[PDB]
Structure formats: C-alpha cells, structure tokens
C-alpha cells in the first residue's frame, strides 16, 4: 500500500584477484532507478529509470561520491569479517546491507529499516526504535560496540526520518506517471492435460504493477491453496509483473472452480473461470 525507497548493497570478495566487487541498486517501490558497480571503469551512479534522468549534475556527482566511499568501506570490511569468523583467504564471502523508508499516509516515516548480512545470514540490524542495534553472534557484537562508540544509530535514524522520506517524495512526483499509476493485470484461464483423473487449470495475471497481488483458487468459495501451484511473481521485462496459479481438477468438473484476483489497480476484486 505505502510507497518506499530502498537501497540494496552487495559486496563480494574475490580471492583470485585479491580485491572485491561492490554493487548497489536503488528502488522506488518495485521500480529500480539507479545502480553503482565498483567494477565499471570510472564507476558512477547511473540512471536505470527514465524519470530519474532529470536530476542535475550535482545529484549524479554527489550520489557517485557516496557510493565510491561506501564501496571502499565495504571492501575493507570484508577483510574484518574473515578475521571475525576464522576464515581463510581461499574462499569467497558476501556482505550485504539493505535500508529504506516506507511513506505513511500522513507523509511521515511509517517504518524505516537498516540491516546487514554475512554469507547469507543476518549479521546486525537497527532496531525498530532506530536507536539501538541487535547483533546476531559474537562477531557482530564487535561491530555493534564500534557503532555504539561512534553513535552510528543517530545518523541512520536522521536519514530514515528525513532525507529518505523527502527523497521518496521527490521521486514519486518526478515519476508520478509511472510510479503512481497502477496497471491492472490482464487475466485469463487455460486448461492442460495432467494425468489419470485430472486436468490442470491455470489462472494467469499478466502485465500488472505494482508487484503485490493475490491469486487464489476456490472450490465453492473454499480456498484450494493446499493443492495449488503458485509461482513466484516474476518481472515482465518492461517494468510490469506476471503470476499464475494452477490446480488439478477432475475432468468435466472444471466449472466448479473459480479463480479470484486482488490487485491495487483493480479497485474491485475479480472472479473468472474456464471458458
């Protein structure tokens, strides 16, 4: 329901090359709008949505500076993390951070977050109150004390309540013709052979935005998600999304099943069945 601005950072160690790679991407809701890649020659923050291109040179210059500095600290940090976990230099390891703000209906911060992971495991996270940290193990406790001594939480809280929300608001207006116009799914049902005593009915939702959607199968109003195949919502490639839900039903019994679609761009729930 509420809009969000989020950034996703990935740093990976490369032992063979004796260096690391840092990749940052930025999103408004389900729409990517910037990237940074330390591996790119002369790396800069680059536009990845058309509406962000109207930002001036000061924006691209200053965003690029931020990422270059962040890239270096995440590279050095990979070295620390290997020492914390008694790891050799032979293996590759992965450090991630994500952070963002959700826009409340009053224009205030609904919820902000800042979290970190190492080799796919929660490492440290800013608590809901935006004033303290939770560390996952004895290694993360080293980081927590460093950040407490340096008062890092106050800066993260200031960013999340302030610049994050005001940036979100500026971006939503700049790209309002796409970011604030919900595209409803194009829906249909198909039938396919399955096995003895059973044909498959597949309910398609195609070309919708934003990503959140509800696809359910009902047999006389009763939810069938137990025997249902529900695929992960997937990108269309043009900024919209797709999803389907499929169910095996008895032959001749097709018309006793209904597919129900809920989407923000529909404004009224839909029912449909096999034709």
């Amino acid at each position: 329901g509420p809009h969000s601005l989020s950034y996703f950072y990935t740093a990976v160690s490369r032992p063979d090359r004796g260096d690391s790679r840092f990749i940052a991407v930025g999103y408004v809701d389900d729409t990517q709008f910037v990237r940074f890649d330390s591996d790119a020659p002369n790396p800069r923050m680059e536009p990845r949505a058309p509406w962000i291109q109207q930002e001036g040179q000061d924006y691209w210059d200053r965003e690029t500076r931020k990422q270059r500095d962040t890239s270096q600290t995440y590279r050095v940090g990979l070295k620390n993390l290997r020492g914390y976990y008694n790891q050799s230099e032979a293996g590759s390891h992965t450090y991630q951070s994500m952070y963002g703000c959700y826009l409340g209906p009053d224009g205030l911060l609904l919820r902000g977050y800042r979290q970190y992971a190492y080799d796919g495991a929660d490492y440290i996270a800013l608590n809901e109150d935006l004033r303290s940290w939770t560390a996952a193990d004895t290694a993360a406790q080293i980081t927590k004390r460093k950040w407490e001594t340096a008062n890092v939480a106050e800066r993260r809280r200031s960013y999340l309540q302030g610049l994050c929300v005001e940036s979100l608001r500026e971006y939503l207006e700049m790209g309002k013709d796409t970011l604030q116009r919900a595209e409803p799914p194009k829906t249909h049902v198909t039938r396919h052979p399955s096995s003895d005593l059973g044909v498959t009915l597949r309910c398609w939702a195609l070309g919708f935005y934003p990503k959140e959607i509800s696809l359910t199968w009902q047999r006389e109003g009763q939810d069938q998600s137990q025997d249902m195949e529900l695929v992960e919502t997937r990108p269309s490639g043009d900024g919209t999304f797709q999803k389907w839900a499929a169910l095996v039903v008895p032959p001749g019994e097709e018309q006793s099943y209904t597919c129900h679609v809920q989407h923000e761009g529909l404004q009224e729930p839909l029912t449909l069945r096999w034709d």
């Binding site: 950034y7 940052a24 930025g26 931020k66 600290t73 940090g77 980081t143 960013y159």
Partner: peptide
C-alpha cells in the same frame, strides 16, 4: 538519495 555516513563493519 543514498545514506551518506561512514559504514564500517
């Protein structure tokens, strides 16, 4: 706009 401040594990 990205968060600026020094980020050191």
């Amino acid at each position: 706009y990205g968060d600026f401040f020094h980020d050191m594990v």
